[PDB]
Coordinates of C-alpha atoms in Angstrom, one line a residue:
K4 CA 14.3 -35.3 -31.8
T5 CA 10.8 -32.7 -30.8
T6 CA 7.8 -32.9 -28.0
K7 CA 4.3 -32.0 -27.6
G8 CA 4.6 -28.5 -27.4
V9 CA 6.6 -27.9 -30.7
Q10 CA 4.7 -29.8 -32.9
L11 CA 2.2 -27.1 -31.8
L12 CA 4.1 -24.2 -32.5
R13 CA 4.8 -25.4 -35.9
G14 CA 1.2 -26.8 -36.8
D15 CA -1.3 -25.0 -37.5
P16 CA -1.8 -21.5 -36.1
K17 CA -5.4 -21.4 -34.6
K18 CA -4.9 -25.0 -33.1
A19 CA -1.9 -23.5 -31.4
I20 CA -3.3 -19.8 -30.2
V21 CA -6.6 -21.1 -29.2
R22 CA -5.0 -24.7 -27.0
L23 CA -2.4 -21.5 -25.2
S24 CA -4.4 -19.5 -24.4
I25 CA -5.5 -20.4 -21.1
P26 CA -3.0 -21.9 -19.2
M27 CA -1.2 -19.0 -21.1
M28 CA -2.7 -16.1 -19.0
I29 CA -3.4 -18.0 -15.9
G30 CA 0.6 -19.0 -16.0
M31 CA 1.4 -15.3 -16.1
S32 CA -1.5 -14.0 -14.2
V33 CA -1.3 -15.9 -10.8
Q34 CA 1.5 -13.7 -9.2
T35 CA -0.2 -11.2 -8.8
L36 CA -2.7 -12.2 -6.1
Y37 CA 0.3 -13.0 -3.9
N38 CA 0.3 -8.9 -2.6
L39 CA -4.1 -9.6 -2.9
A40 CA -4.1 -12.3 -0.7
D41 CA -1.5 -11.3 1.8
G42 CA -3.2 -8.3 2.5
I43 CA -7.0 -10.3 3.2
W44 CA -5.0 -12.2 5.5
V45 CA -3.6 -9.5 7.3
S46 CA -6.8 -8.3 7.6
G47 CA -7.6 -9.7 11.0
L48 CA -4.6 -7.6 12.6
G49 CA -6.4 -4.2 12.2
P50 CA -6.3 -1.8 9.4
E51 CA -2.8 -0.3 9.4
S52 CA -1.7 -4.0 8.8
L53 CA -3.7 -4.4 5.3
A54 CA -1.5 -1.2 4.3
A55 CA 1.5 -2.2 4.8
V56 CA 1.2 -4.5 2.5
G57 CA -0.5 -2.7 -0.3
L58 CA 1.8 0.3 0.0
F59 CA 4.2 -2.5 -1.5
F60 CA 2.1 -3.6 -4.1
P61 CA 3.4 -1.1 -7.0
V62 CA 7.0 -2.1 -5.8
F63 CA 5.9 -5.7 -6.2
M64 CA 4.6 -5.0 -10.1
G65 CA 7.4 -3.2 -11.1
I66 CA 9.8 -5.9 -10.5
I67 CA 7.2 -8.8 -12.2
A68 CA 7.4 -6.4 -15.4
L69 CA 11.3 -6.3 -15.6
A70 CA 11.0 -10.1 -14.5
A71 CA 8.3 -10.8 -17.5
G72 CA 9.5 -8.2 -19.7
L73 CA 12.8 -10.7 -19.7
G74 CA 10.2 -13.4 -19.9
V75 CA 8.6 -12.4 -23.1
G76 CA 12.1 -11.9 -24.5
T77 CA 12.9 -15.1 -23.7
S78 CA 9.8 -16.6 -25.0
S79 CA 9.6 -14.5 -28.6
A80 CA 13.3 -15.2 -29.1
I81 CA 12.8 -19.1 -28.6
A82 CA 9.9 -19.7 -30.5
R83 CA 11.2 -17.8 -33.5
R84 CA 14.2 -20.6 -33.5
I85 CA 12.0 -23.5 -32.5
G86 CA 10.1 -21.8 -36.3
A87 CA 13.5 -21.2 -37.8
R88 CA 14.9 -24.9 -36.6
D89 CA 18.0 -23.9 -35.1
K90 CA 18.4 -26.0 -32.5
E91 CA 21.3 -24.6 -31.5
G92 CA 20.3 -20.5 -31.6
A93 CA 17.6 -21.8 -28.6
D94 CA 19.6 -23.9 -26.4
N95 CA 21.7 -20.8 -26.7
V96 CA 19.1 -17.7 -25.5
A97 CA 17.8 -20.6 -23.1
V98 CA 21.1 -20.4 -21.5
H99 CA 21.5 -16.6 -22.1
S100 CA 18.2 -15.7 -20.4
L101 CA 19.2 -17.4 -17.3
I102 CA 22.4 -15.7 -16.5
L103 CA 20.6 -12.7 -17.2
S104 CA 18.0 -13.8 -14.6
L105 CA 20.8 -14.4 -12.0
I106 CA 22.1 -10.4 -12.2
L107 CA 18.9 -8.7 -12.7
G108 CA 17.3 -10.2 -9.7
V109 CA 20.1 -9.5 -7.9
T110 CA 20.9 -6.4 -9.4
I111 CA 17.0 -5.5 -8.0
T112 CA 17.7 -6.5 -4.8
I113 CA 20.8 -4.5 -4.0
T114 CA 19.1 -1.4 -5.5
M115 CA 15.5 -1.8 -3.6
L116 CA 16.7 -2.9 0.4
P117 CA 19.0 0.6 0.8
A118 CA 16.1 2.8 -1.2
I119 CA 13.1 0.9 0.0
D120 CA 12.9 3.8 2.8
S121 CA 13.0 6.6 1.3
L122 CA 10.6 5.4 -1.8
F123 CA 7.9 4.5 1.0
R124 CA 8.1 8.2 2.8
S125 CA 7.6 9.7 -1.2
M126 CA 4.4 8.1 -1.0
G127 CA 3.3 9.8 2.4
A128 CA 4.1 7.1 4.7
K129 CA 5.5 8.5 8.3
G130 CA 7.2 6.9 11.2
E131 CA 5.2 3.9 12.5
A132 CA 3.6 3.4 8.7
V133 CA 7.0 3.0 7.3
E134 CA 8.3 0.5 10.1
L135 CA 5.2 -2.1 9.2
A136 CA 5.7 -1.6 5.1
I137 CA 9.4 -2.2 5.2
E138 CA 9.0 -5.6 7.8
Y139 CA 6.8 -6.7 4.5
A140 CA 8.9 -5.2 1.6
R141 CA 12.3 -5.8 3.1
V142 CA 11.5 -10.1 2.9
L143 CA 10.0 -9.8 -0.8
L144 CA 13.1 -7.6 -2.3
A145 CA 15.5 -9.9 -1.0
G146 CA 14.0 -12.8 -3.2
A147 CA 13.3 -10.7 -6.4
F148 CA 15.9 -12.5 -7.5
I149 CA 13.7 -15.7 -7.5
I150 CA 10.5 -13.4 -8.9
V151 CA 13.0 -13.1 -11.6
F152 CA 14.1 -17.0 -12.2
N153 CA 10.8 -18.2 -12.2
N154 CA 9.4 -15.8 -15.1
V155 CA 12.4 -16.6 -17.0
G156 CA 12.6 -20.3 -16.5
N157 CA 8.6 -19.8 -17.5
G158 CA 9.4 -18.1 -20.3
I159 CA 11.8 -20.8 -21.8
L160 CA 8.9 -23.2 -21.1
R161 CA 6.5 -20.7 -22.7
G162 CA 9.1 -20.4 -25.6
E163 CA 8.6 -23.8 -26.8
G164 CA 4.5 -24.0 -26.1
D165 CA 4.8 -26.1 -22.7
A166 CA 2.5 -23.4 -21.3
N167 CA 1.1 -26.3 -18.7
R168 CA 4.1 -26.7 -17.3
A169 CA 4.6 -22.8 -16.8
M170 CA 0.6 -22.1 -15.5
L171 CA 1.1 -25.7 -13.3
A172 CA 4.6 -24.4 -11.5
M173 CA 3.0 -20.8 -10.6
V174 CA -0.4 -22.3 -9.5
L175 CA 1.1 -24.8 -6.8
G176 CA 3.2 -21.7 -5.6
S177 CA -0.3 -19.3 -5.7
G178 CA -2.1 -21.6 -3.6
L179 CA -0.1 -23.6 -0.9
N180 CA 0.6 -18.9 0.1
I181 CA -3.6 -19.4 0.8
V182 CA -2.7 -22.0 3.4
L183 CA 0.6 -20.9 4.2
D184 CA -0.6 -17.4 4.7
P185 CA -2.4 -17.9 8.0
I186 CA -0.4 -21.3 9.9
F187 CA 2.8 -17.7 9.5
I188 CA 0.5 -14.9 10.3
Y189 CA -1.8 -16.4 13.0
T190 CA -0.7 -20.0 14.4
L191 CA 2.6 -19.0 15.1
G192 CA 2.7 -15.2 15.8
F193 CA 5.3 -14.2 12.7
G194 CA 2.1 -11.4 11.6
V195 CA 3.1 -9.4 8.7
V196 CA 6.9 -10.8 8.3
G197 CA 4.9 -13.8 8.6
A198 CA 3.0 -13.6 5.0
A199 CA 6.1 -12.2 3.3
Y200 CA 8.0 -15.2 4.8
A201 CA 4.5 -17.9 3.6
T202 CA 4.9 -15.6 -0.1
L203 CA 8.9 -16.3 -0.5
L204 CA 8.6 -20.1 0.3
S205 CA 5.8 -20.0 -1.7
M206 CA 7.7 -18.9 -4.8
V207 CA 10.8 -20.5 -4.4
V208 CA 8.8 -24.0 -4.1
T209 CA 8.0 -22.7 -8.2
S210 CA 10.8 -22.2 -8.5
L211 CA 11.7 -26.1 -7.4
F212 CA 9.6 -27.2 -9.9
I213 CA 10.7 -25.5 -12.5
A214 CA 14.4 -26.0 -11.7
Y215 CA 13.5 -30.0 -11.7
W216 CA 12.2 -29.7 -15.4
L217 CA 15.2 -28.0 -16.2
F218 CA 18.6 -29.1 -14.8
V219 CA 17.2 -32.6 -12.9
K220 CA 14.3 -34.5 -15.6
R221 CA 15.5 -32.3 -18.6
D222 CA 12.5 -33.6 -20.6
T223 CA 12.6 -29.9 -22.4
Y224 CA 13.0 -29.3 -26.3
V225 CA 16.2 -27.1 -25.3
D226 CA 19.6 -28.3 -23.9
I227 CA 20.6 -26.5 -20.9
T228 CA 24.4 -26.5 -20.4
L229 CA 27.5 -24.2 -19.4
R230 CA 30.1 -26.4 -21.9
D231 CA 31.1 -24.4 -24.4
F232 CA 29.6 -21.8 -23.3
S233 CA 30.3 -18.9 -25.2
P234 CA 28.4 -15.5 -25.0
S235 CA 27.2 -13.9 -27.4
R236 CA 26.1 -10.2 -28.7
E237 CA 23.3 -11.2 -31.5
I238 CA 21.3 -12.7 -28.9
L239 CA 21.8 -10.0 -26.2
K240 CA 20.1 -8.1 -28.5
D241 CA 17.7 -10.0 -29.5
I242 CA 16.4 -10.8 -26.6
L243 CA 16.6 -7.2 -24.8
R244 CA 14.9 -5.9 -28.4
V245 CA 11.7 -7.2 -26.8
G246 CA 12.0 -7.3 -22.8
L247 CA 13.1 -4.0 -22.2
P248 CA 10.2 -2.9 -24.4
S249 CA 7.8 -4.4 -23.1
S250 CA 8.7 -3.5 -19.4
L251 CA 8.9 0.2 -20.3
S252 CA 5.5 -0.5 -22.1
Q253 CA 4.7 -1.3 -18.3
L254 CA 6.4 1.7 -16.9
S255 CA 4.3 3.8 -19.6
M256 CA 0.9 2.7 -18.7
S257 CA 1.7 3.2 -15.0
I258 CA 2.5 7.0 -14.9
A259 CA -0.3 7.0 -17.0
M260 CA -2.3 5.8 -14.6
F261 CA -0.7 8.4 -11.8
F262 CA -1.5 11.2 -14.7
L263 CA -5.6 9.9 -15.0
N264 CA -6.1 9.8 -11.0
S265 CA -4.6 13.4 -10.8
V266 CA -7.3 14.6 -13.0
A267 CA -10.2 12.4 -11.1
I268 CA -9.1 13.7 -7.9
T269 CA -9.5 17.3 -9.2
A270 CA -12.8 16.6 -10.9
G271 CA -12.7 15.1 -8.4
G272 CA -11.6 14.8 -4.5
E273 CA -12.0 10.9 -3.2
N274 CA -15.1 10.8 -4.3
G275 CA -14.1 10.7 -8.2
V276 CA -11.4 8.4 -7.8
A277 CA -12.9 6.0 -5.8
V278 CA -15.4 6.2 -9.0
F279 CA -12.6 5.7 -11.9
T280 CA -10.6 2.9 -9.7
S281 CA -13.9 1.0 -9.5
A282 CA -14.7 1.2 -13.3
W283 CA -11.2 1.3 -14.4
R284 CA -11.0 -2.5 -12.8
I285 CA -13.9 -3.8 -14.3
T286 CA -13.3 -2.9 -17.7
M287 CA -9.6 -4.1 -16.9
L288 CA -11.4 -7.3 -15.8
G289 CA -13.0 -7.4 -19.8
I290 CA -9.9 -7.2 -21.0
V291 CA -8.9 -10.9 -19.3
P292 CA -10.4 -12.9 -21.6
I293 CA -8.4 -11.5 -24.3
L294 CA -4.6 -11.1 -22.5
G295 CA -3.9 -15.0 -22.8
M296 CA -4.5 -15.3 -26.8
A297 CA -2.2 -12.2 -27.1
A298 CA 0.3 -14.2 -25.9
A299 CA 0.1 -17.3 -27.6
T300 CA -0.5 -15.1 -30.7
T301 CA 3.1 -13.9 -29.9
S302 CA 4.8 -17.5 -29.7
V303 CA 2.4 -18.5 -32.9
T304 CA 3.2 -15.4 -34.8
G305 CA 7.3 -15.8 -33.6
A306 CA 7.2 -19.8 -34.8
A307 CA 5.6 -18.2 -38.3
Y308 CA 8.6 -16.3 -38.5
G309 CA 11.2 -18.5 -37.8
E310 CA 9.7 -20.9 -40.5
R311 CA 9.5 -17.7 -43.0
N312 CA 6.1 -18.3 -43.3
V313 CA 4.5 -14.8 -44.1
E314 CA 1.5 -16.4 -44.5
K315 CA 1.1 -18.8 -41.1
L316 CA 1.9 -14.8 -39.2
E317 CA -0.7 -13.5 -40.7
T318 CA -3.2 -16.3 -40.5
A319 CA -2.7 -16.8 -36.6
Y320 CA -2.6 -13.0 -35.7
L321 CA -5.6 -11.7 -37.7
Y322 CA -7.9 -14.7 -36.4
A323 CA -6.6 -14.0 -32.8
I324 CA -7.9 -10.5 -33.8
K325 CA -11.4 -12.0 -35.4
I326 CA -12.0 -14.5 -32.3
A327 CA -11.0 -11.7 -29.7
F328 CA -13.5 -9.0 -31.1
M329 CA -16.7 -11.5 -31.1
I330 CA -15.9 -12.1 -27.1
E331 CA -15.0 -8.0 -26.4
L332 CA -18.6 -7.8 -28.2
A333 CA -20.3 -10.0 -25.8
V334 CA -18.2 -8.5 -22.7
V335 CA -19.2 -4.9 -23.2
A336 CA -22.9 -5.7 -24.0
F337 CA -22.9 -7.3 -21.0
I338 CA -21.7 -4.3 -19.1
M339 CA -24.4 -2.3 -21.3
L340 CA -26.8 -3.9 -20.3
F341 CA -26.2 -5.5 -16.7
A342 CA -24.3 -2.2 -15.3
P343 CA -26.3 -1.4 -12.6
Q344 CA -26.2 -4.8 -10.9
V345 CA -22.6 -4.5 -11.6
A346 CA -21.9 -1.3 -10.2
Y347 CA -24.2 -3.0 -6.9
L348 CA -21.8 -5.9 -7.0
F349 CA -18.7 -3.6 -6.4
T350 CA -20.6 -0.9 -4.1
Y351 CA -22.1 -3.4 -1.6
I358 CA -21.0 6.2 -5.6
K359 CA -23.5 4.6 -7.2
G360 CA -24.9 6.4 -9.9
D361 CA -22.0 7.5 -11.1
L362 CA -20.7 4.8 -11.5
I363 CA -23.7 2.8 -13.3
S364 CA -22.7 6.0 -15.9
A365 CA -18.8 5.0 -16.1
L366 CA -19.6 1.4 -16.9
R367 CA -21.6 2.8 -19.7
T368 CA -18.8 4.7 -21.3
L369 CA -15.8 3.7 -20.8
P370 CA -16.0 0.0 -22.0
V371 CA -16.8 0.4 -25.1
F372 CA -13.4 1.3 -26.6
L373 CA -13.0 -2.5 -25.7
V374 CA -14.7 -3.4 -29.2
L375 CA -11.6 -1.8 -30.6
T376 CA -9.2 -3.1 -28.0
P377 CA -8.2 -6.4 -30.1
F378 CA -7.1 -5.3 -33.1
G379 CA -3.9 -2.5 -31.5
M380 CA -3.7 -5.3 -28.9
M381 CA -2.9 -8.5 -31.6
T382 CA -0.7 -6.2 -33.7
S383 CA 1.3 -5.3 -31.0
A384 CA 2.0 -9.0 -30.5
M385 CA 2.7 -10.3 -33.6
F386 CA 5.3 -7.0 -33.6
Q387 CA 7.1 -8.8 -30.3
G388 CA 6.7 -12.1 -31.9
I389 CA 9.6 -10.9 -35.1
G390 CA 11.2 -9.4 -32.4
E391 CA 10.4 -5.9 -32.7
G392 CA 9.4 -4.9 -29.2
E393 CA 10.4 -1.0 -29.8
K394 CA 6.9 -0.8 -32.1
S395 CA 4.7 -1.8 -29.5
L396 CA 6.6 0.2 -26.9
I397 CA 6.2 3.7 -29.2
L398 CA 2.3 2.2 -29.7
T399 CA 1.7 2.2 -26.1
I400 CA 3.1 5.7 -25.2
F401 CA 0.9 6.7 -28.5
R402 CA -1.9 5.3 -26.5
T403 CA -1.4 6.3 -23.4
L404 CA 0.9 8.8 -22.3
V405 CA -0.1 11.2 -25.3
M406 CA -3.4 10.4 -26.4
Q407 CA -5.1 8.9 -23.2
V408 CA -4.1 11.9 -20.8
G409 CA -3.9 14.4 -22.9
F410 CA -6.9 13.8 -24.1
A411 CA -8.6 13.7 -20.8
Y412 CA -6.2 16.7 -19.3
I413 CA -8.0 18.8 -21.9
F414 CA -11.7 17.3 -21.2
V415 CA -11.2 18.2 -17.8
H416 CA -9.6 21.5 -17.8
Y417 CA -11.2 23.3 -21.0
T418 CA -14.7 21.3 -21.2
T419 CA -17.9 21.2 -18.9
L420 CA -17.8 17.0 -18.8
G421 CA -16.4 16.8 -15.0
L422 CA -14.8 13.7 -14.2
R423 CA -16.8 12.4 -17.7
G424 CA -14.2 14.1 -19.7
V425 CA -11.2 11.5 -18.1
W426 CA -14.4 8.6 -19.5
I427 CA -14.9 10.1 -23.1
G428 CA -10.5 11.0 -23.4
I429 CA -9.9 7.2 -22.2
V430 CA -12.3 6.1 -24.5
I431 CA -11.0 7.9 -27.8
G432 CA -7.6 7.9 -26.6
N433 CA -7.5 3.9 -26.9
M434 CA -10.0 3.8 -29.9
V435 CA -7.7 5.6 -32.1
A436 CA -4.7 4.5 -31.2
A437 CA -6.1 0.8 -31.8
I438 CA -7.0 1.9 -35.5
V439 CA -3.5 3.2 -36.4
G440 CA -2.0 0.0 -34.5
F441 CA -3.7 -2.1 -37.1
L442 CA -3.0 0.4 -40.4
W443 CA 0.5 0.3 -38.8
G444 CA 0.6 -3.4 -38.5
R445 CA -0.9 -3.9 -41.5
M446 CA 1.9 -2.0 -43.2
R447 CA 4.7 -3.8 -41.5
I448 CA 2.9 -6.8 -42.8
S449 CA 3.1 -5.5 -46.6
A450 CA 6.5 -5.3 -45.9
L451 CA 7.1 -8.9 -44.8
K452 CA 5.3 -10.2 -47.6
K453 CA 7.6 -8.2 -50.2
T454 CA 11.3 -9.3 -48.2
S455 CA 10.1 -12.9 -48.5
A456 CA 9.6 -12.5 -51.9
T457 CA 12.5 -10.6 -52.9

């Protein structure tokens, strides 16, 4: 008893990684565009309304981080079981994750709703700015469960190679919102709150497609039942050992971003911040083609770990590095060459931005070596290693090397670029060296 997705995981790893890359990426990224579309749609109401939608953005990404954290812990745990032919173990991870989604989502709602007012005022919102932002935040915080269920049900689909279905449901919600937004905001006059209800409604639609697949159609590989449900401490530890370190990695990067922005103010000021902001978003676009491949790699290395197949696993992740490396060489060449054209497009602080695009994106050619190693760590079930590596990349060597450059050096805001490049390049080398050690150990365990 199998499916098209299950055969994919148990088949050639290269075929699986390449086939999964696109839907993996899209099915895990379109969610980010809710806040973007809501903000653009309400801008016709004035800069006040645009600012209210955007104040919620880091709160919103934090919830995604936790939802998506549980998602990968779930997906990577199912993938291993399918590779292991542990049918009952996979059915069990899926039910455990669904109960966790209800617990985590509701806990988020009842913890944020009373806290959201104090949180906004700490950012700097005062008076009416808090009021309009809260009108928006209140709707979505009370739908936090929906966001978590979507990311976990999809983690179940991606756990068995069914990325297309996970991608579909997300795309339908993300697109409905673009159409729904102006109807609620303007045609019905619900304003900023209208944008929030349009986002909440679109997310529910995503829920209903996923729920139909899991609970009504049930054409999935795994079976979802509460019949003879016995809670498993060993299953919790398997999910959480990837999921929680995944959320914390996301936290570590946000903290890193905060300290890095502080240095770019010091250098600095509003101008250095505008430049750092523009350059960092471009360089992040340059990683976009590589994100999905690192997500497939986790599912594929996972299936090979469950099969106890150490060659299939090694072949899978080394191949992902290989493909990712060739792609990033083109990306940085594109940025190196066409920098003044790209600088112009994103400033349509110009010459300072050109100088930043010819420095910053250079670490991208080493990124895959540390990124795919980290994805492999998650595949074997060892998220804490990916977490450690992440902290080392961001809180120690990224922040630490930029602070010294700007406080002990003459480079100015440029020291922030150099510190990030060096910080990222060194970590990729250490991580990749670490992954090789981990590989050699797995080859010995498998022999003995």
